[model samples]
Target chain A: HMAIEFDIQESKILKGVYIITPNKFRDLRGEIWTAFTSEAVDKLLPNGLKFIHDKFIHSKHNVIRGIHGDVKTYKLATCVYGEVHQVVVDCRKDSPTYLKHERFIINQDNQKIILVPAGFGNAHYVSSETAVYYYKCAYLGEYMDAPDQFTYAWNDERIGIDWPTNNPILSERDILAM
Target chain B: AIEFDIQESKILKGVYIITPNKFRDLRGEIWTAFTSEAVDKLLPNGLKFIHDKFIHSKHNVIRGIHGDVKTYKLATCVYGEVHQVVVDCRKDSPTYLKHERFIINQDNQKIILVPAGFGNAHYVSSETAVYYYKCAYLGEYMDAPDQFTYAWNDERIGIDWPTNNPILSERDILA
Candidate 1:
């Protein structure tokens, strides 16, 4: 909530880091990639459990959701099967990489493995037919699941997301516009 | 002190993960970080300990080395005060600024974690201070000196040191 200064970015640094394999169905299934290394995940992850958590959003080009971050673990996201313009911002109070935001147009073509640290909230707009997203995160425990556990607002003035359209769809609470 | 500056992508993409034990207080004074449950939820290998040892004096410093490891370094500045320096080091990085420095001392009570190959150095401001650092890779240490070092007083990499007069050690003299 407080404005802190750290490097804010979504450059190629946070983009792709995977080995792609070729397939043959439409010449392949989207863009074929592999889990060649639990090594990358293990190295970047402090938590030891891994599960597939997928979120699919179907909306217009300007549709957006977030300006939010977990009170939980970090997330490694993929716009795995469709097109979407994704965004991220570092929100760690003491991090050198704080307050930075980076954007990427990810899809079946330019497959990317985006790393968004825990506590840094994120948001994205669908730029294609229907986009399916996947991410790796620690479970939202039976006890840890509460509103206070996470941050809020799709457009908190301090965060200044510049949500694509001024009057877009917003949840009941986020409707007020932070 | 992992200071991934403005434009360091190579090093940024290479950041390693860190899992430190958190001590909780009754009133929740500390942030209440239970990394065990958190770590168990995402990683394959559990937490580990790193045994790092180093010594330094005044400005006769080592603008030496850093790494993201594409893995994680859960660092804690074990002794006095040392400015943990970092450079993006990635030739193709696109963040705004490229080089950055971070100071990690006993005052923080925590290690500033880092990604990989960012390049590092410790400017020992106090007398002879020994620092204890940690890492995921026991073999990360260079047998052939993988870390590069520049003169502490080198103008090319101007550092805003608290003080300049440092006692030069043998490593500094030969280095």
Candidate 2:
């Protein structure tokens, strides 16, 4: 068997962004689905970009973990067991589409992945009963935190991302992101 | 007793375009996929999906021209838009060395089939695109140096790609 090659797709809202959806097979034995593959890794990822760390989050409905990013970090995010309203905002002053944002809804059913590139802020709102969110970061996990983490108000009207809910549970850090 | 619809279209010999019906109402929308019984009823015999994977491509990134020996695949877009370009590489096929393009996006609920002996590559026409696929064969990348390679920007291929210049990796630029 040769390495299984998956299809690659593009995003319209932002530049240098991509999406991934896994092929799933089901039979009497149960079901089979792929989490990620090198074909995807080789074809879709930006050149010279490598994932050095991975993490997951569990959030109740209406909970948001977001509006976070650093100077030079890319986050590949996906939903493992539920659904989320994911938002990404390009904050790079030099970027052509800076200050623009896009929204995506990913779930366990679709098992899609979103690439939140470096210099972009991201936030996700759990839309299902609960969401098991997983993501891979291009930054090396030197310690429990990455340097220069920046936060933005999830509901910042200037960016104007139409998040699903008006009231999302946030952390103290997010409360002060303004 | 049960009811649903799957749209199937033949793009070329062995290549197909499969579209799944999306069920929607007030609550949300439901899409059903991965039922072996339903898929087997449509595609050619012996087309079993043995491997599954996902891909993310940045804007202007073009990957491929790689062809697998005796391997077939089904691809679907879960997010964003893409221009999927394929060239028939089968020496004996009527469309040999011919190329065509398909636009894959979540809105269309479209899935493309790249059959064996076809040279395949896609361009990221949007900000970012995520693609998912199921393959019939299990092959390793390092072991398959025999896979065909074509430069994404090669004029010989006659692919009227939307962008004149695109960002490429060392592997893609040299392919």
Candidate 3:
């Protein structure tokens, strides 16, 4: 029976991005960690923004996903199990830091969460045997799937993302993206 | 958007079982585990869940028949299979001492809404399980001292679990 505590700090690199570091409690019966609390997150969110959906992706090592974003969705991404190299790119064209990317090494132990606002692209490369990338998204109206979102190639020169491998497994859509 | 269908338990008065429509593709699967709009509609006095927690356990581990008086929990098996059981612990309720069991896993994506005054427990049936709990309560959280615990095999609530000799924690063994 341990209390959950966390700190939410504004990202220095990305204007609207936030980094959430939640404390994980360990004991004889295994460990427990809190993902988020509405009251804690509400303090930092913009007016009328609330989470409406939750999803997770389980992928094997060397698998790469995303570099995707949309104009209406805000995502809080974390690796629940195993490890991952996560990248967030500022895709808002009119912003001062447009196209600038920041990297994070997230794993089950660290339990770091990256809150990427709308108009930013995010991608992750699995660095462990298998990884689970969980996200809670906030948006109005219908969900914006891959077809409705913008995609950038993992190796796009303009973004200059220093991915570990030049030949990481990719989705057909991601590979074909400009 | 994924829509959730709710089913009220005939055995437990305030227990509700919810299933979500999952979307699958080449890049694995995705589904909505919780939505304020859908869940609020089901509650008599709508709830606002504030805390989210996850418990990752190994195979054959049995945890709880434990609960408190002020928290409403929405629980789901996010990673593996589990045999979940919920018991009505409210002394004045019509369904007191009654219980219901559910088989929850990634495939069905079933979520159970456990009201306050109900004891909930689960046995990990797969190699490992990640149990997600979204709790709604006022003021400070009720830790171990504030909660009640019932033995997994308490005769009062005759739950039909798969295995009688599953692994248990010290707290569970002492309950």
Candidate 4:
């Protein structure tokens, strides 16, 4: 069958967070990688969670986005084009790992995924000339737009995320966030 | 405003060509590929895409002209360039036996929505290509064994492919 396998591992630093590495088949025709399959992901998700949307963001080197999260969406993100330095933080107030953070270097060749559960914040810096970040979101209701979600400053001292660049580019909203 | 545009294919009935709006700035470009809120509005009864498959191929490789009766495929070339061809195989379709071709690449970022009973194929024109297929259907996926294949160079379909000597699998060559 065409169904592929993924090496799923739990993040030691952040509770409920996971690292997924998919198997890539390389041959004379380059390589093939399956980003996600219903059968595989369905088993990983919590009850009532279904992937309803997919989004892609492309950024140049030094670009930073996020430190943003919502209470109700589970996101599975991966770097599909180049390389990215990604950081995830547990923002759930009641969780044991609240404020705990972990870092990962994801790239196209590696095809690794970071599964961030609800109540967690994530941000990434593009390390290559350009990189494409893809994510699939699972939720019950409508999508949680930016205005409806919470944002934390990338350099927030309380969390202390050691991003690659101190002077990375940011969006106006990301810049003004306290 | 919606970040994508959908146009009915002039050459083939019931086929649509989607163009996602790409915003380019000093920090590079960004675009949205599959947002349910935006895409579902374009469908008659709406569809929830459940499977995503990617095929990476090198230059001079051709695959497909294969499809099934239960899947609606939204195909896009995520990286590099490809010459895509779609042939109407539904005998009852008004546009039956009709075909359309598209040159999709990373820059253009065009997405083609091919309905069931249509055979679709692509030729990697660039050094390498990554083709993404967002499929919507109920029940189990229709794999290679469950699908129908049309010869890449089948005289009946009369597809004017970019190359006559493309790399093909045994199944495609024998179809």
Candidate 5:
């Protein structure tokens, strides 16, 4: 066993976007990072939000699962393992930051969580051997299949995300969007 | 909206596996991982999963035998195949130090649960394996940590792993 140092900090990357940095202590063997508890979230996250739906995407290096969003979904995103370049664009037309995008490096090394409210477009790509991305949605219901979902090209010039690599592997849906 | 038919384990308490009652068409395959009726009571805020993890392992790679004091883990092999070993380390449980094994693969689409106070690890029986897991608690490794070791070939735990000489990490070999 090693020393356990637990701390939580707030990172305000954008309005209505909250970054929760929980206490993470690493030793030679491995790391023990803290997970959000109900108690932890009541204080750290606003709106008394509770995560109900969990999702994951695992892809090899250079693969992008990007720029996907749905109406009325609050998401808490993080990379539990490996590395990824995460980007989020505020799609809330009524908000000031609407259409504004921000990028961050999330991985086991950084151990950061990006809490996104509804009306935001988000995407991420694997930058390590393999990346495991985690998303906790506050809304727990059947996922919107087609008409209710929205997607934008990962390289859409309109958003102009400045993705790290030019040769990213993409799905047909996203590739066509580009 | 979609629904799933899930069943609880008769042997393993609090262990439930999601089995899609019906698979819809024109849409690849679809099923629910957690439902309000099946798993809401086990978790504090329902399947308020904190994180999603994907473990990609090479042939003969033996990963764990590691666990913390709390965490409800539901794991399944989404891609290849794997043999997951779980040991109940809760001292007060009737099955304390008891172990169980399951083979999870893409075909079956079944999941295994390792609730709190249980130690878990997996062996890659196929050329490659992709193990996906959803955990209810997301505490750091050392917090409430309790290590219980059993070699992959350990005849003691009744794991019955396929290989006698499996490739393992230095940490697992010495564990």
Candidate 6:
């Protein structure tokens, strides 16, 4: 158990975007296939041309969420049923490539699927809790009511979440917006 | 017209493995470091560990500098005999990151082609070496190579340089 290195190669966060989940496909028992993709957002996004937003979260362990961003870029992050430990921050700052300071381990025994890249700045937690979390958010009603388009302060100590929800539930402008 | 062989994708998002370098001697040996979950089938990305910093050492005519930063990288030359050139320089496109070059020495242990704002220069005529590269590098570390050493001995960068006028210094012949 001595393998866990997340330097994230200078940090591209997401590329050739990946995700393809199907755990329950009982054909004769229920005629189920359990695979969805009518271009499931351009198969994780090519031009990211389809995603009418569909988010969900349950978070339990050190529940955190952000280092945020807007101006587009919200690819994928999963656990559809339970687990998390995602983190990202790229913002194209004159991008010589991608930036780094990375970490990942999307829960639920790692059915782990990630792509989350755009302007970069993301956060997550919840190593379990019935554990369900989800995504598909390209846009949804003013990018979810703009509210200054979601930025940090979910107990910001530089957005360093370690989880067990320390009074989770934000937006009082998350206590006088930042 | 860009397609001069080199699409080994996996722009540093965890770079898969293979300590493969053909063997069977020195008292028997075979190899494998195939992790990143076992090459993830032709390396479908997601693997990490590359914080390089060997900085200096020249013995086989080493060469480097095409000026990189578009990112998406992978390089190989694990122990002994180096030979590389791979460049792309996205100078805003239109190829000519020095026309293009990819040799990857040692009878193909493999790892070459480096999209994302390319520029990679390597040299080691054998008789001693070490190589292992990875990227997604958006700069930081002396801005990288910063070319101009007669353009790594230009010939339109037709680098087929297995060996020639070896041994360098003088900042790599006034790079």
**Tens-place lDDT digits, model 6, residues A13-109:** 4443344433332121111111123223344444535443333344444445555666564655564444666766554567644444355676423
What is the fnat of model 2 with respect to the true interface contacts?
0.09
Separate clash counts for every candidate: 34, 24, 0, 0, 3, 14
- Segments of candidate 6 deviating more than 4 angstroms: A1-48, A51-63, A66-75, A78-111, A114-123, A126-163, A167-172, A175-178, B1-175
Q: What TM value does model 5 have?
A: 0.70
Ordered list by lDDT, greatest first: 3, 4, 5, 2, 6, 1
Residue A132 of model 1, lDDT score: 42
- Candidate 5 residues B1-175, lDDT tens each? 5444566667667666665433433212224454334555655544445544556667877777766666777777655688887876677888776777788764666767677677778888887776767666655433333555545555545677787777766666776
Q: In candidate 1, what are the lDDT values of residues B97-147, reduced to their tens digit?
A: 245555655344334444444544566554333343433343433332444
For residue A147, model 3's alpha carbon misses the true position, in angstroms, by 3.6
Q: What TM-score, to 2 decimals, does candidate 1 have?
A: 0.39
Question: How high is the DockQ of candidate 3?
Answer: 0.60
The DockQ values of the predictions, listed in order, are 0.01, 0.05, 0.60, 0.55, 0.18, 0.02
lDDT of each: 0.44, 0.65, 0.84, 0.81, 0.66, 0.45
- What does the lDDT read for residue A90 in candidate 1? 68
lDDT, residue A19, candidate 5? 72
lDDT at position B23, candidate 1:
25
Q: Per-residue CA lDDT of candidate 3, range B1-175, in tens?
A: 5688899987676788999887666555667788777885665565677778888887888889989998889898877789988888888988888988889987777899998989989989998888888888878888877998899999988898888897877778888
Say which candidate scores most in lDDT.
3
lDDT of 1 by residue, A22-125 (tens): 22112111111332123334454445643323222334444565556765555655554347667787667676665566766776555555666667766676
Better of 1 and 2 by lDDT: 2
Deviation from native of the Cα of residue A98 in model 6, angstroms: 37
Residue B28 in model 3: shift from native, Å? 2.0
Write model 2 residue lDDT over A31-68, tens digit each, in one string.
23566553455345476655544344656678887688
i-RMSD of model 6 (Å, 1 decimal)? 25.5
Candidate 2 is graded, for docking, as incorrect
